[PDB]
Design a binder for this molecule. Structure first.
Ligand SMILES: CSC[C@H]1O[C@@H](n2cnc3c(N)ncnc32)[C@H](O)[C@@H]1O
Length: 195
């Protein structure tokens, strides 16, 4: 149903902007919240590319989104799923029946998801998306494929640590989802930034 990203960076680097943009395009602005922005954040501090796409953002943390958005169902104990790389159980399609909200770490990893968990010990229930680390947009892409499209994790086709060779080179230490044409799905604009 609804996707929440907890922003755990200060600002918005080009990478973050591209990821969040892709997320906005795939889940729809009405189904995404960016929460836990720094206390002094105002509209001026939010990238115009994300505002343009209808980004719903808040400086409130998980325990406050309901105060801010009457549209959202009460974040209720046990019905919010934390996508957690160190969880003992992988998300499966029937979990769609068991959670209304899916929470992701707004991070650019070099763990931090455990800080998210520890922060809200009674709210969140963890589910994993496999044994290898994904970018936020890949994690959200996979979650949607499981919850909305009901594909088992094990039927999804990934690439582990793809190399992008522009001439006779960068390898991304993340797991990526494959498109029908067998290419890794990247946020629009990401490849140029990599080059
Ligand atoms: C820093 S990665 C961005 C976020 O995507 C989610 N995520 C990334 N990789 C995985 C994984 N293997 N399993 C579950 N969730 C993940 C986590 O919520 C993480 O904070």
């Amino acid at each position: 149903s609804k996707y929440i990203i907890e922003h755990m960076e200060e600002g918005f680097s080009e990478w973050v902007i591209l990821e969040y943009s892709q997320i906005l395009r795939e889940v729809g602005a009405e189904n995404l919240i960016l929460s836990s922005l720094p206390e002094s954040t105002t509209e001026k501090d939010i990238p115009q590319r994300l505002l343009k796409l209808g980004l719903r953002w808040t400086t409130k943390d998980l325990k406050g989104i309901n105060e801010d958005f009457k549209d959202l169902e009460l974040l209720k104990d046990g019905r919010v799923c934390l996508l957690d790389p160190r969880a003992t159980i992988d998300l499966q399609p029937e979990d769609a029946t068991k959670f209304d909200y899916f929470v992701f770490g707004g991070i650019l990893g070099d763990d931090r998801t455990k800080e998210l968990k520890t922060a809200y010990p009674n709210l969140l229930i963890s589910r994993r998306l496999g044994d290898k680390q994904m970018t936020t947009d890949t994690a959200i892409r996979t979650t949607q494929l499981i919850i909305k499209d009901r594909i088992a994790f094990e039927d999804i086709k990934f690439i582990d640590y793809p190399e992008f060779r522009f001439n006779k080179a960068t390898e991304m230490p993340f797991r990526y989802v494959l498109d029908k044409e067998g290419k890794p799905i990247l946020p629009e604009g990401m490849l140029d930034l990599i080059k």
